[model samples]
Target: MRLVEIGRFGAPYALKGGLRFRGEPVVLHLERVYVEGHGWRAIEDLYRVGEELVVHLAGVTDRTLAEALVGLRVYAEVADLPPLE
Candidate 1:
């Protein structure tokens, strides 16, 4: 399994941010996967997007900055992701 940075969350989608995939744009909620105590924990409501992914992040609130994050890298454990089905 490999981890790839889809895109940096942006502004304009909703009260949250945007998503930038390699190819076409998709809507996926971001959950902060973390480990607490002896078990794992996932944070909810961290992020949410509507139909379009066009919102800008706090640090990156511009076209140029957003463009730079186009190729940013995001990682997910092989078992952390959903199945192909």
Candidate 2:
């Protein structure tokens, strides 16, 4: 698999489906993410709260579901990485 480690899922955000993101904003360039045990999922939304990063994954439409993914590693296909100077 041509994948690259992106970041880890942190605590649940507010009462919504947002999950704290522990990686760089590069994740914003990704269309999908892979989590072990959870399988592959699409990025529903991505944003930031103050200095903290937050992301919402498809099907993780609530805090309870988002909480379940805490501590999970996130990955993206190498081909999905954005090309930059």
Candidate 3:
């Protein structure tokens, strides 16, 4: 599947391996996301905080693990994206 750049991972959220997301809301529609080196990761949880997104991914279960992903680019399959508004 062709992938499109979506967002970047920011700091770790709280202490549960959640990361701050800075990107379009369309990310909510994706089942998986990609980052360089990490390839595709399953999105275990996602939610909004004000205008930002907090995302939890499979295998990232602690702050240290999530911190390792900071600044990575987020990508999703073009076919999985909804029509842009």
Candidate 4:
């Protein structure tokens, strides 16, 4: 299985479920997600990179939440992903 690492979302974009990945803007949707080694969990958002890659997880909804996750790299197992392209 493959693993993908991602950064946290910014404050301004937290409200509308929008965030940045690799310095680009992306929108996230409500979905079930979990952080590797952090245990299985449900996320209310789906992180996508334009029309390319996607990551699913939660814990970022407010300034405090977003700030806490900042700089903390996140990972997701590729096997948990659905076909996208």
How high a TM-score does candidate 1 get?
A: 0.30
| lDDT preference between candidates 1 and 2, better one | 2
RMSD values, in order shown: 8.9, 1.6, 2.2, 6.0
Residue lDDT tens for model 1, 1-85: 3544444333333223333322123224444322212222233323333443343334444455445444443333445455686
Q: Which stretches of candidate 2 lie over 4 Å from their true place?
A: none
State which candidate has the highest lDDT: 3
Error of 1 at 17 (Å): 8.2
Ten consecutive residues with minimal summed lDDT in candidate 2?
Answer: 76-85
Could you estimate the TM-score for every candidate? 0.30, 0.86, 0.85, 0.41
Give the lDDT of residue 8 in candidate 3: 85
Candidate 1: residue 28 Cα off by (Å) = 4.6
* Colliding residue pairs in candidate 3: none
Q: Write the per-residue lDDT of candidate 2 for residues 1-85, one digit (tens) a residue.
A: 9877778888887878888877767877778888756788788888877888888888998888888888898887868776674
RMSD of 1: 8.9
Among residues 3 or more apart in sequence or in different chains, the pairs in candidate 1 whose N, CA or C atoms overlap within 3 Å are: 5-74, 10-18, 10-55, 10-56, 11-54, 11-55, 11-56, 12-55
| Residue 19 lDDT, candidate 1, scale 0-100 | 31
Comparing candidate 1 with candidate 4, which one achieves the higher TM-score? 4
Q: How many pairs of residues in model 2 come into backbone collision?
A: 0
Please provide, for model 4 over 6-77, each residue's C-alpha lDDT reduced to its tens digit, 9 standing for 90 to 100.
333333344443333332232232234333333444555444545543332364556554444444444545
